[PDB]
Every structure is written in C-alpha cells, then in structure tokens.
C-alpha cells in the first residue's frame, strides 16, 4: 500500500520529467533519483516506470530527459542495488544515443555512460563490459566509439582489479580501434589504451609501456622495441594483463624477418613465461607463440638461435602444461558467466521467478562469476555482494540459504593448480633433500623434498602445531636426511645458542669465547654493526632486545654463516629495530629462513614460502601475501593477517549541555516532505526525538513514506516544512551496504588510505550529498554556474562560513554580479559584503565542492570537532573495530576477508565518533556471524541507535522504540 | 718550458701504438684499441696534448681502409669510467667525422660508427653537453643518409640516460629536431625518431601528463588529431611545476589548438594554457614560448563571438602576461644570455687575454666555455663545483695556480650574469588569507626586516629560512605576540607558539588539571580530546612532570586544538625527539588541517612538512613555492646555510678493515719485485726493474712531471695493467681505493638519487664500478650473444658454462671456469657440449668482464661473503659511514643529491670510494680539482688515516708534512727514496 504509493509517485515524477526542459531537467532528474534509490518497493520493481524510461530513451523528443534522469539515478554514492540491474540493461540503448546526429542527445549519452560506469558495483563488471565491447565493435558511428572508449577509461579507475582480469579481452578491442580510419577515433583509442595499461601494475616492464603502445600503432617499431626489451629481467608474477601487452609484440617478433630478432623474441618469451605460475593464465596466449616457435626451431641455421627457441618452446609447453601433439589444455570455465548462471538457474528451479526479475538473475550470475576470477570465496563476501540483489524477488532466509549453496558450488569449480617446479629456479642449491621427519615417534613430514637456493629468503608456514620449529631445529642440527654438513653449509640458529657465560662477562669476551676469531676481528665487526666502544666493553646482561639481535647477527657474519634461521625474530623488538632487521635481511646477501606470526614482517622479507600441507612441504614463489592467493587454507592459520574477532564502536564525541543520555540532541516537530510535482506529501505531521540513549527501530514494509522518512533523517532530503532542532556538533553515521560492496574499487590501498580517501574533503563522501551527482571534479568551467539571487545573475566569488539549516548546512557566499550578459563587454564584477547570501549545501557541492570542503574544514576546527587523519589515530580507531595496527598501515585491502572488510567499512563509517548510528537494513547483506558481532556492539554503543529493518528477530533485545509510517504519517 | 723526458717518451709510445693500430685487423682490433685507450687516458703528458696522435686518428677515421680500426680506438678511449679530461675535448672534436661514417655504404664502418657515438655519449662529463649536442643536431639535420639519422637518434636516446638533468634543460631545442625527423620519408627513420621522442619525454619530471604522452607524440606525427587530443587533455589537473621539458612537449600542441577552426577547440586550448602556465615560476622558462601563444590568444579574443570562449581566452592571456613578466606593448622580457656558450666564452677569452693560448688548445677553451654555460643553467654556483668540473681542462695548457685564479674569476663573472628573478606569487594558490602585512621589524633598535611583506594562507604550511642570526626566532616571537604591523588580533587569528607557553604549574599537577587550568573547556571535554589524541587514562591522571619529550610535544599540540588555533608556530621542534616521534609530528602537521610555520635546521623535516619557504634575503622576506629541496633550486645560495664555521668542512676516512697476521703498520701488505711492463708493439718497456712495498703506514708521494713511466707505474699499482714480468705479493683481503677526479664530475648524472642510492649504485655488483676494470669497455649490459664469446683453451674452442671460484693473480684476479666444448663448429650439427670439472681452467678477470660480468660479480660476491669482508648496503651502515665523512644521516637517506653543494658532493664521492674500508688510498692529483677549503680538510683526513696513503701529485706544498716516502720515475726506472 505505502509501496503501491511509490508506484504512483514515480508516475507523477516521470510525467513531469518527460515534459522537462533543459532548464528544469536537472531539478526533476534529481527528484526521481533521490526517490527511486530509497527503500520504496517491497520485494518488487517499479516495472512500468523502467518501461517508460526505456521507451523515452529511444525517442528524440525525450532522449535527453530520460538519460539525464539515469545519470542522476546512477550517481557515485547512492545507486540502489534494487535499481542497478535495470540501469545497466539500458546501456545498449544509451550507446546508440551516443552516436545520434543531434548534439544534445549525443552529449548527454556520453555523459550518462561515464556516470553508469562509476556507479555500478565494480564486481558486476561482467554484466556491463560486454555491452560496451559489443557496441563499439558493431557501430559505424565514430562519435559512439569515442564515447565508449571514454567509458572504458573511466572503468579503469572505477574497477582497476576487475578490469585487470579483463585485459586479455579488452586489449585486442582497443588495438583494433587504434586502427580506425577516423583520426579522432585513433586519437581516442590511443588514449584509452594508455589508460588501460595502468592495470598492468608490473614494475619490470612499466617503463616500456609507452614503447609497446607505439608498436601496436606501428609494427615497424617492433624490431626496435624487441631490441629495446631484451634486458628486462623479470621478477614479479606474469599476470593476464602482462601477457595481453607483451605477447602481441613478441608474436610479431617471432614472425619477423631478421634472425637476430627471432632469437631475441624467444629470449624474452623464455625469460618471461617461466614466471608463469598458472597454466590457465598462459593458455589463451599459447596459440600466438607456439606456431612462431615451431616454425623457427626448424628454419634457422645458427645453433644459438635454435637452442634459445627450443628453450622457449620447452618452457611454453611446461608452463602451459600443454599435452601431447601440442594441444592446449581445456580452459576452466569456473569464472564464466554462462557457468555461474547455470548454477543459479538450477538452484532457482523450484522458485517461480517472474519475467521482470530475469535481468536480476543475470546480474547475480555476473557478480558470482567475477568473485570467482578474483578468487573471493568466503561466505561474508558473497552475502555482501549478491544477497541485496536476491531480496528483490526472494525472501531473505530463502535468498541466504540459496546464496550459500550457490557459492559452495561455484567455488568447487575452481581448478586445482599444480605445484612449484624444483628443477628450474636460479642457482647452486645450498641443499636438495628427499626426506621424512619424526619427532618422538610422531611423523611431521613423510617422503617430502626440501631444496634451498643460495642468497634466497624463505618463510615457513603451517597450521599451529604442525612442526615448524622442529623442522628448523632439525635443519639447525643437521637431522634432515641429505642436508650438507656444517663445514659445507654453515647454519646459525639466531638467538637460540646456549652457553655458560657469566652475566658479568663483557660483550667482547662473550663473542670471543665462541672461538670465532681474535678480539681485534671481533671489535672490527661489532663496530661496523653499530656498536660503540662503551657497549663492546659492557656486560652482556645490559644489552637490550634490539642489541642482542644485532649482536647475534654480527656473530653470524663472524661464523661465516650460509643460512640464518630465525624463529619469531620480531618478538620484544620495537618498530625501528624491526625495520632495521628487515633492511639487514634483504641486504646481507645470505639465505635466511623465518618463522613468524607477523605477516607484515614475512611480506617484507620472504621471497618464497615453504608451507606444511599434510605431511608434505610445498613451495610457493612470493611473500606471505602472494602465498595466500595460491593457497586459501592459509587464511585459517595463526598469522597476523588471519586474526579476526568482535568489535566495539567508539564513544561518541563530547557534547556540551548534554548531562543525561535521555536529553534530546535531535528533535523534529510538525515535519513534512513533499516532492515538487507530487499530488500530496510523502510524509507529514512528523514528530520525533533522538538521544544518546535512543534505541529506535524503523519497521514496516518498504514504501513512499518510510523511505522518505529515512531520507529526511539522514540528511539527504530537506524538509518542505516543519522545525528541526539539532544540538550543535551532532553527528550521524549512516551505514548502508553501498560502502561494503564498493570498497572493492579500493583493493589497492591500505585500510588507512581508504579511510583517508573517504574523508578527503572532511565529510564522509559515501553518505554526504547522496542527493547530488558528485561526479563533478574536472569541472573548471562548471564553476561558472550561475546562481539566481534577488532576481540577479551571479557566480560564486567565495564561501566564507557555515551554519545549520534544519537537517543540513547553509553557506555564506560572496558573489560576482553579471553585467552586459551576452555582449562583447560582458563582465562579472565582484559584489560587496552586503550582498552575501546563505546558500544550501545541495546547491553548491556539484559546482563548488572544493570551496565547500575548505569551509567545512574551518568550521570543524573552530568547533574543536575535527579529528586528524594521522596513521596513529586511524590505527587506534581501527583497533576498536578489531583490526590490527600493522595490517591497517601496511597491508592492502586486497588481502582482507569479507568479514575484515566489514570491520574496515564499519570503522570508516564511525570514524568521526557519531552520536547516532543509523543502520540501513543490516541483515540484508550480513551473515549470522557478522550479525552477531554487530548486535553486541550495538547493545554496548554509548550513543543513539536507529536500525531500519524487516527482521523482528534482529530488533528484539536491541531496540525499544518503534517508528512506523501509515498513510504518510507516524507516531513514536 | 723545460723539456720533459718521460713526457716526450709518451709521444713516442703513442706513435708506436698508432702504427700497430692502423695495421690491425678485425681479429686483433680490440686488443690494441684497448692498449691505446689505457695509455692515452693516463697522466702521460706534461701540460700539453698528443697533437700529432689526434691528427692521425682523425685522418684515419676519414679513410676507408682505417676507419674501423681508428673508430674502435676512439670507442675504447671513451669508456664509461676512464675518459681523461686531458683527452675528452679532442675526442668530442672527432664526433662530426664519426657521424659521417655512420652513413657509410660499408656495413662494417657504418656499424662501428654507430657504436662509437653511443660510447662517446656515455663517456663525456654530462655537464659538457653543450659541446656535444650541437654536433649531433647539426649532423642529423643536414645529412641525407637514413642510417646516419638512426645512429644519431640512438645517441640522443643514450644521452637522456647519461645526462638526464642536462638534457631536460635542452628539451626546447631537442624536441623540435626530433619532431622534424619524425616527418622523414623513410619509414625506419620515423619509427626511430618516434622512439627517441618517447625516450626524451622521460625528462618530464612528474606524472601530470603521463597518460597522454603517447597521444601527444602521435599528435606530432599526425596534427589532424590535434582537435581530439585537445579534448583529451582538457581533463588535466596540472600540479607539478611547469619546466622547459613540459613546455617543449605541450606548447606545440596548444599553439595549433589556438589556430584551429572550431571555437570549442580555441576555448579548450585557452583553458589548458591557463591551468598549465600559472604553474610557471620563472618567466625565463616560458619566455621562449610566449611568441607561440600570445598572438593566437589575441587573435582569438578579437575573432570569437561567444562570451565564454572570450573570457577563457582573456583569462589565459592575463596569466601568460603575469607569469611571463611581459612588458609594455606585450614585449617579451629580455632573454638573459647568462647560460649561452657565447657568453661564457667571451668571459674566459677576456680573462685569458694576457695568456698566449696556442691553436691546439682552442678546442679546450671552447670546452671549458660549454661546461661553464651548463653550470649556470643548472644554477651550480659554488667555488668547489667549478673547480671539480673546469680546472682539470685548464691545466692542459696552464699551471694550476694561474688556472685556479682565473677559474675563480670566471665563475664570479659568469654567475653575476644570472638574472634577478621576480618574487613568487601566492594569490592563485589554494587558501583564504589569514593575514597580509606590509611591515618592518626591529629588535633592540637592530633592523631585522625593512619594509617587506608577509602573506599567510589558511591551512597552508610554511617554513622560515635564512642565514644564522638573521632573526627567524624573533619574527616568530613577533607573530605570536602580534607585533608584526597589521597582523590579526588573537580573536581573529589564534596563534599558538608550541611549547613556549609560560605558566606557574606545580610539578605535582596532573596532565588533566594542567590543561584545565588554561581555561579551555570543561574537564569532560578535555578528556575527550586527549583520549582521541592518544593519551591513556593513566597519563591523563599522572603528574605532568612524568611525560617524556614525545608526550609533551603531543600534549602541546592537543592544547592547541582545544584553543582552536588558526596558526601553529614551531621552533626547532625535532630537538629531543627520536625518529618515531619526529615521524609522528610530520604526519600530524600534514593532516591537522591548520596553518603552521616552522623553523628547523633539519631540511629533511622541512621537506616533509612545508609547502612554502619564506626566506630572509638581506632585510626582506621572499616567498618560494615548494618545500626546502624545491626552494634550493630557485635559491642556490641556500646550500651554504650550515657553513659559517670551518669545522663543518672536516671529515674522516674509515678505519681499514681487519687483516690477520698484520701486527704493525710497517708490515708490508703489498710487495712488488723486479716488476716490468711493456705494451705489445712498443720498442721497449715503459717501466722496468720496479721494487716497492706498501703498509698501513705508507705515506708516499709519486712525484714528477707526467710521462710514460710514471703513468704506467700508477696503472700497475692500481690494478689496471697486468705486469709483463716480475712478482707481486698482496696480503689476503687487501683493498685499495683509487680516488680519481672522474667520479667527482660524473656524479652530476645521478642528481636524482639520494646519497644512499648513489653508493648502492656504485657497488651494485659488490665492487666499485667507477674504478674496477678501467682497461675494459664493460658497457656490455645488453650482452646476450656476446656471452657466446668463444674462448680458445688448450687449442680448443669453448664457451663458458659457469664461473666457480676466484684466486689472486699478480695485481688482479683469476676465475675458475667450467666449459661447453664446441663440436662441428660451422656445420649443421654444431653443438656445445658441457665438459667435466677436470677441464676447468683459470682465466684472468680482464678477459671475462666484457662478456661475463654478471657471472664474475656473483663469484666476487661469494668470496666477499666467505672471506667475511662483505659490507651490506643497509641504510644504517651507509648513514654511519657517510656521517664520518661529514654528511648528515637524514640527508643521506632522504635528500636528493641535486640539493647538495659542490663541497658536499666531494664528501659524498669520497664516502663512496672508501665504502669498503680500504687499507690503502691512492689519490690521483687531488690538487687538480679541489679548492683550498677541500684540500685543507682532505689533508687533515689523510694525516689521521689509519691506513696507507699514496699521493700522485705535482704539489710539494700539499705533501709537506703529509708524505715522507718518494717515488720518482726516471728513464723507466724507480727506486723509492726518503723515509718512513
Ligand atoms: N525491493 C527490494 N529489493 C531488495 N531488497 C528488498 C526489497 N524489498 C525488501 N527487501 C529486503 O527484504 C529483506 C527482508 O526479507 P524477508 O524478511 O525474508 O521478507 P519480509 O520482510 O516480507 O518478511 C530486508 O532486508 C529488505 O532489505
Ligand atoms: N697534460 C695535462 N692535462 C691536464 N692536466 C695536466 C696535464 N699536465 C699536468 N696537468 C696538471 O697540472 C696541475 C698543476 O701543475 P703545476 O704544479 O702548475 O705544474 P708543475 O706540476 O709542472 O710544477 C697538476 O694537478 C696536473 O695534474
């Protein structure tokens, strides 16, 4: 009913929109946008509305209006998941409009495509990309190609990790476009190409990227570029993105004319492909290299070029895991949309999914498929991204039971990759053993192998109690079958030496007694290690944790060690000393084997990881983080990374005048909201109060009145009438699932930089200005927006102060008055203080976000409410939410679990220590596990709480007050 | 003069070596080229040049029969680590002829020429670019042979890597040349030109336009893409300062954009021009480009009807006039010619007017003029910097004293031509103004500042700088107490002089009550902030007398927040703060969102915090955009702020590493007996019957005029030349450091690196690349099919499969190699079969380095680790080592070498050279490139060096009371004299 009311409101607004002019177009699009993205319909979609919107887009007369509405609907912080799939479905029609002969329609279309690319869940890339690639390949309108190429570029910044995996399919498309006959298209294709390459993220070839781009544009530079690439010694993994940029150059290298080049190409091919850890990766590229190699291993005289070629060929076959007769293995279809769709259709066979929800099912499949390519398999991650789409037509419990099953089956398709290859790696082995290990009749390792390379740094991992320390002890004592003797390979178990030196003994005589050389030779090295004469002569009993470690490593050098064995080396060590230890290990030139619960340490030191898997040792090239990507079961160990527990929200900020948690800090009276254009208000005669003790639950089915009440409460919509009292400095944290899904656009940052990103302007960009298109950042000219004040045209000269205006802010603005408008003597003259005026935040942010921010910054400081974004403060804050300091300041979000991302997002949401936390349907995307932790945190929250939900089970023992909207009204 | 015997012997040796050279075949070519190179680059001639030799070389390069041989000699002579300034200008003088050969029909001659140009580019003093570049630009523009163009283009590319800073300043001249070349009909030339262009853009020192570089280059190739390309850059937010490199790439595009038909393109062009150019800080930077922007903008303003496009066009025109300092009637400001070679050339010729400079030295004067012109362009003005670069060329035809006296006058006169340069502008930057004052400052009747101005922006960070004692602290105190005329009252602009507050709190008062007694809010409110800040409940309740230095600083800032401070004032805030607390302060100041003014002797702290530098100049305050490092670029005099006392110039060399079996400083660690060296092809050995010893107490002076014998003796002593006969004993682990002027000048190729990175670069392979293998080309990095070098051992052709160990051999090293035996060499069945250990053989280092450097470095590395002599390149040790040589730790790991003064660069190079803690230091003519101040410090450091010292000098003055042992070569013989 209140839901059926929504359908009507959408009709009135759409009726006004179709009539809209270039003058009022943005005003109504905004209304449609703010209303459509809220909780307005109960388990269904405004089918008729989307139908009219679709139709309107295809008609000249309304193309601009309909599309401009989409751009507003598809803003960066408020696109509702209940709407998202229906917006993406319009991209095709919109691409066509990007090729229209009419300038206005063509421009709005181009604009709308960028808006959509920046608004969708980045993980849903597989539902959007095909529309853009299909379009640019099949169109003959050059302006359309340029608009789609621009949308490709915007996507690189919006979903970098997701795009990276699509590179092998995207690069050839951009390459082909670079050869378009239209010069403008050539120019645009080259630019998008340069943009797309930002996803390679490979230090080894980075500096040659512009040289590869040029080659795509002109083959004649291939020899020149091959000659230019020969020396690149690869270190970092060779990803799909690396190949889509390398192979085409090489392929043309092989089929070159001169023997030298053919040879060079092979070297590069060889050198690069051996670094391909997964066969599925090189699979789609094999066909562009193998033939060129076979043709060469049988057409070039010189026995040098041949040997090279063969080596490459052999590498390709090994790495490619090719089969007999040069047959490329059958690619896995775990990440194919076609596959995940079959799984979801199958799981929905006994559910009657109406026609209008089919598009959603496809979206779900698309998201599921992408999560598989990104190897995101934990339960919370899936609930975070797909559940919200499913409740569009299914009930939460059914959706969740079905979802959990969908992920289990989708995950099982993930192919089991092979193991490292003991043969190839570089260098004289320090040891190469086949052995078993038993500790007190207990088998720790059976018929396993251990090969260590000189100057290489290794880390040993495994489930707690698997025998990590015992193996190390074994290596230290030479109790591994086949291990070299101490004379052949000197091992030093750092800090684990036992002796009988008196606590009186001097540091000098302590080392001397070890029979490691003369006292002169000892002082020499100790000094070189940072020791002073005073320390060398002092009693060992006085050395600190840092100096004992340094002392031990100094002894290692004098002992001429070949392998340094360390066990929890960062224990009792402060940050400067850990940093010192990291630097020393990376530069001492000696092999080291480490066991540490500090993943950050392991990442900074290890080049390889030796993991316990059953009673076998399995090698993995890379640090701990790389290790985890290749071995999921590692995320369940006892490393600093895997540590996850429950959380607590911060204490709200101090408020003067509030002595009792029952005093109202927010009180609204006779409040009413009515969209301009609607027949009657969505909510009226509203009255309510909030306090630090509030425990309110906004219950009921989605509808016009319930959502609008929410939108006025959270600051999105400005009440059309009524009084709003807000205690100075009162802050509200609005928690939506949008932030939880969209954090996937920031996997490249540390939790800390993410929090800095969200509060860049001083306010939460995720929730502030949800009613505005905030895509305006490159608007040098959009700053010339004209404001109409007292009947005169004006431009903003400055913004000086701020003050509360109901449920938002107003800003004092100084102006420039427009004179002789339209004439050759037009000018904008600065006005006097007297003519300054207060202008609502909503009318300023789109064109002057920077000035608004500078002003918000001042007011925050002037009122003592500003919290600095220091690493220390962020770490402290994140600790309360269950995140570890080292991981927050040094680890990339990419390595966090769904649950950890939940903590990070809650931390980011509560960073300003709000007095009122408003949660928007938290059970819609959080599993029982996360719901539990959140429940406790909300019970203990020292500030007010307002939970919007349908789940009564979640509200019991948590809330006590109830808000329910009936016929545009309600009573607390 | 007086005829110099050993010196005349050198002329004779070169003649014999040239005779052998002109006869060499592609087989033995490299062997004698190497001989000519190692000899020519030594101290062989006393104040003159082997004139006839250079004439023969030039005549040989122009002759088909001998072009290959002669150019290959030039190639070996121009190696990356041993090209002598005595020869350098005569080598560059041969470039035009070498270019012509790069376009020769003959396959061999053309190839050798191409290779030689690269060698020369990589061998010259980067600072002498203006002497080499013109040869290359002129050659590529007048030649019609396409292979010659490809070779020169390759040379420009190598230039970018060998002298990046110097090339960046040359971009406005280079880019147009590369662009024309891209329009060459020949398809291989267009590709090569485009590649060179792509390489040149690397001189753009920022990322503002990275994603558009390939588009801009493509645009130059196809100007019809200008309109669309202009549409693409519209979205560029220029942040970094606009330099000559950025302008050279942007202006041609914008200039065409302005002349385009569509009003939309004329408008977009203006917008980009406006945004980019208001980031120009020196009008001389944009002056040569104004003529390509002003007329178009003027024409567009008169032609366009649309008011928006008109306003945009007019706005860009006003920015151009402001930033370009354009005068009346839109006159482009007079171009300073301070950096023109013709300007510095006129200066030196005038200073040399009473000196008779022979025709054969004309090329050197011109070379000296080029170098000076570049020092000025790079704003390198200190005395030591000029002595490092120029003195060595001057002593080719002048005595050291006369050279140094003229050189110092040359520098002063040249530097004096550097233009004034208007102050810097804050207005268009981002901030509301906290203040804007016109004032004077007097302290006890002493004038600190006279009629100057001070404008501070809200939320902006400033650093105050100026010579010691100029008044920085008084100004700050003045600001805090509102004693600067027109400064806002406390109510309008609250300032907090961090940690300089005075009150009467008991040492008993708790932290909470301390803050509370200041009347800054209730106790509840205060507790809320302190906790938010990081204070625990325990600390909030404890006595203030209990806080550490770090928490007092943190408390002080917290109190500033409770007082709602608009401006924070900090005076030497890093004092009494460990690195963790200093890092915390930096972070806080950068994120507190409040304006801050800092005074600090730690330029590194200023670089991490400041956005602007307010500098005391005379009795005026001058503002500069950027942090300290950027400040020093616009104000080079600022590199002498911690100079005032003679003590900051001193340094000490490290203690040589421990050696077993050496219990006295007289114990010989190096002993040579019956030693002789004779170049193959000469009529008689250069030195013979040589005997000598070196110990940790050696204090030797290798005296005498330059010559064949003296130079060869040194070349054997330092390891470059393997003795032809005689015995050499070297104590195990004995290390020698050879300090040559070459390293001091060539560091200008690493201005981008921090001192720490520079040192890591020099010892990347565990050995010093500046002095090791000076007799080898060693420029083989992309040596992949040259590792397929065939070694003839025991009459059988072999390839190296691996190198396994090292052992001492005379004055160098031998390496145990395993081989691949060649079978059916030539046939289709040819193969390289690995041999057994029994066939391994010891091969001298000199024969392996050019083709197997990586493998050799891996062996040297293992021997260093096994002998326990290895020194890890950790930040801590590198800092500890550089501090001994008088360099600050913070500067060594965080500051770019570009910001160091000439005297500081000297400490750094000395630091690099003695990094491995040698037992002997051999200095090659130190007085030739060091000024009085550096010499004094060096003399003291040598006197205290706990290892041996060997000084190759002509100065009896510098050795008096330093050395007592004497080595003087006479007729190929030398017997040590003096005492120890
Ligand atoms: N149109 C919609 N699109 C997406 N989710 C919706 C929609 N309508 C309701 N939901 C979600 O339905 C969830 C509750 O489902 P459930 O309790 O099973 O059904 P009901 O609320 O009718 O008892 C809530 O989390 C709510 O967010
Ligand atoms: N041919 C040369 N080229 C460059 N420098 C030279 C040459 N010959 C000598 N010098 C330099 O001359 C410098 C000063 O010598 P000086 O003392 O003036 O003359 P002399 O040593 O003959 O008494 C020495 O540092 C020496 O390195």
UniProtKB/Swiss-Prot annotation, chain B:
Q: HEAT repeats span which residues?
A: 8-45, 89-126, 128-165, 169-206, 208-244, 245-282, 288-326
Write down any Gene Ontology CC term. Answer: ribosome
Please give a single GO biological process term from the UniProt record.
Answer: cytoplasmic translational elongation
Subcellular location as annotated: Cytoplasm, Cytosol
Crosslink Glycyl lysine isopeptide (Lys-Gly) (interchain with G-Cter in ubiquitin): position given as: 353, 639
Q: For this UniProt entry, what is the primary localization, expressed as one broad class?
A: cytoplasm
- Pathway(s): Protein biosynthesis; polypeptide chain elongation
Question: Which Enzyme Commission number(s) are on file for it?
Answer: 3.6.4.-
Residue numbers binding ADP: 45, 47, 86, 395, 399-400, 706, 925, 928, 954
**What positions are modified (Phosphothreonine)?**
975
Q: What is this protein called?
A: Elongation factor 3A
Q: In which organism is this protein found? A: Saccharomyces cerevisiae (strain ATCC 204508 / S288c) (Baker's yeast)
Q: Which gene encodes it?
A: YEF3
């Amino acid at each position: 009913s209140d839901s059926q009311q929504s359908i009507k409101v959408l009709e009135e607004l759409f009726q006004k929109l179709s009539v809209a002019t270039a003058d009022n177009r943005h005003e109504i699009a905004s209304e449609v946008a703010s209303f459509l993205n809220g909780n307005i319909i109960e388990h269904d979609v405004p089918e008729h509305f989307f139908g009219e919107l679709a139709k309107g887009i295809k008609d000249k007369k309304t193309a601009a209006n309909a599309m401009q509405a989409v751009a507003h609907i598809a803003n960066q912080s408020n696109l509702s998941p209940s709407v998202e799939p229906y917006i993406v479905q319009l991209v095709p029609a919109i691409c066509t409009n990007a090729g229209n002969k009419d300038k206005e329609i063509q421009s709005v279309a181009s604009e709308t495509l960028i808006s959509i690319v920046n608004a969708v869940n980045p993980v849903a890339i597989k539902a959007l990309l095909p529309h853009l690639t299909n379009a640019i390949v099949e169109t003959n309108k050059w302006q359309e190609k340029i608009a789609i190429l621009a949308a490709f570029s915007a996507m690189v910044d919006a979903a970098k990790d997701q795009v990276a995996l699509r590179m092998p399919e995207l690069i050839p498309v951009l390459s082909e476009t670079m050869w378009d006959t239209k010069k403008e298209v050539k120019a645009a294709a080259t630019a998008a190409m340069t943009k797309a390459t930002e996803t390679v993220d490979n230090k080894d070839i980075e500096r040659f990227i512009p040289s590869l781009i040029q080659c795509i544009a002109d083959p004649t530079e291939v020899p020149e570029t091959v000659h230019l690439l020969g020396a690149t010694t690869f270190v970092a993994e060779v990803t799909p993105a690396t190949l889509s940029i390398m192979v085409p150059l090489l392929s043309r290298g092989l089929n070159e004319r001169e023997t030298g080049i053919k040879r060079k190409s092979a070297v590069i091919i060889d050198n690069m492909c051996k670094l391909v850890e997964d066969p599925q990766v090189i699979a789609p590229f094999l066909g562009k290299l193998l033939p060129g190699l076979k043709s060469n291993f049988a057409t070039i005289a010189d026995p040098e070029a041949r040997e090279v070629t063969l080596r490459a060929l052999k590498t390709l076959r090994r790495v490619g895991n090719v089969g007999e007769d040069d047959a490329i293995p059958e690619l896995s279809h775990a990440g194919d949309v076609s596959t995940t769709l079959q799984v979801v259709n199958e799981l929905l066979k006994d559910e009657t999914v109406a026609p209008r929800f089919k598009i959603v099912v496809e979206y779900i499949a698309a998201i599921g498929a992408d999560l598989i390519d990104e190897r995101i398999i934990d339960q919370q991650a899936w609930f975070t991204h797909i559940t919200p789409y499913m409740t569009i037509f299914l009930h939460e419990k059914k959706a969740k039971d079905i979802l959990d099953e969908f992920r289990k089956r989708a995950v099982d398709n993930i192919p089991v990759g092979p193991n490292f290859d003991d043969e190839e790696d570089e260098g004289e082995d320090l040891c190469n053993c086949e052995f078993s290990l038993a500790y007190g009749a207990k088998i720790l390792l059976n018929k396993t192998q251990l090969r260590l390379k000189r100057a290489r740094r290794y880390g040993i991992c495994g489930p707690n109690g698997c025998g990590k320390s015992t193996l190390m002890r074994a290596i230290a004592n030479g109790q591994v079958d086949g291990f070299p003797t101490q004379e052949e390979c000197r091992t030093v178990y750092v800090e684990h030496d036992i002796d009988g030196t008196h606590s009186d003994t001097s540091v000098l005589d302590f080392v001397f007694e070890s029979g490691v050389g003369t006292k002169e030779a000892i002082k020499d090295k100790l000094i070189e290690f940072g020791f002073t004469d005073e320390m060398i002569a002092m009693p060992i009993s006085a050395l600190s944790g840092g100096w004992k470690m340094k002392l031990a490593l100094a002894r290692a050098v004098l002992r001429n060690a070949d392998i340094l064995l360390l066990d929890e080396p960062t224990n009792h060590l402060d940050t400067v000393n850990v940093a010192w230890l990291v630097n020393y290990l990376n530069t001492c030139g000696i092999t080291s084997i480490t066991i540490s619960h500090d993943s950050v340490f392991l990442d900074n030191v290890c080049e390889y990881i030796i993991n316990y898997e059953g009673l076998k040792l399995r090698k993995y090239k890379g640090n701990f983080t790389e290790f985890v990507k290749k071995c999921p079961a590692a995320k369940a160990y006892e490393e600093l990374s895997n540590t996850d527990l429950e959380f607590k929200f911060p204490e709200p900020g101090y408020l003067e005048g509030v002595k009792t948690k029952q005093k109202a800090i927010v009180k609204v009276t006779n409040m009413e909201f009515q969209y301009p254009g609607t027949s009657k208000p969505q909510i009226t005669d509203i009255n309510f109060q909030c306090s630090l003790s509030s425990r309110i639950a906004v219950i009921g089915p989605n509808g016009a009145g319930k959502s609008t009440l929410i939108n006025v409460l959270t600051g999105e919509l400005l009440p059309t009438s009524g009084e709003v009292y807000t205690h100075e400095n009162c802050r509200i944290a609005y928690i939506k699932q949008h932030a939880f899904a969209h954090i996937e656009s920031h996997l490249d940052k540390t939790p800390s930089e993410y929090i800095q990103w969200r509060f860049q302007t001083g306010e939460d960009r995720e929730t502030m200005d949800r009613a505005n298109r905030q895509i305006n950042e490159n608007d040098a000219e959009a700053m010339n927006k004209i404001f109409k004040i007292e009947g005169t045209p004006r431009r903003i000269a400055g913004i000086h102060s701020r003050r509360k205006f109901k449920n938002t802010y107003e800003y004092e603005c100084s102006f420039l008055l427009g004179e002789n408008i339209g004439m050759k003597s037009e000018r904008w003259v600065p006005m006097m203080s007297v003519d300054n005026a207060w202008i609502p935040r909503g009318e300023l942010v789109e064109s002057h976000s920077k000035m608004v921010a500078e002003v918000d910054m001042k007011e925050a400081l002037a009122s003592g409410q500003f919290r600095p974004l220091t690493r220390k403060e962020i770490e402290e804050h994140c600790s309360m939410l269950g995140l570890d300091p080292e991981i927050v300041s040094h680890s990339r979000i990419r390595g966090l679990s769904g649950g950890q991302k939940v903590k990070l997002v809650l931390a980011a949401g509560t960073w300003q220590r709000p007095h009122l936390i408003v949660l928007d349907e938290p059970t819609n995307y959080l599993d029982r596990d996360s719901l539990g932790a959140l429940s406790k945190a909300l019970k203990e929250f020292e500030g007010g709480v307002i939970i919007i939900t349908h789940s009564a089970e979640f509200t019991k023992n948590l809330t006590e007050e109830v808000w329910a909207v009936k016929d545009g009204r309600m009573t607390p």
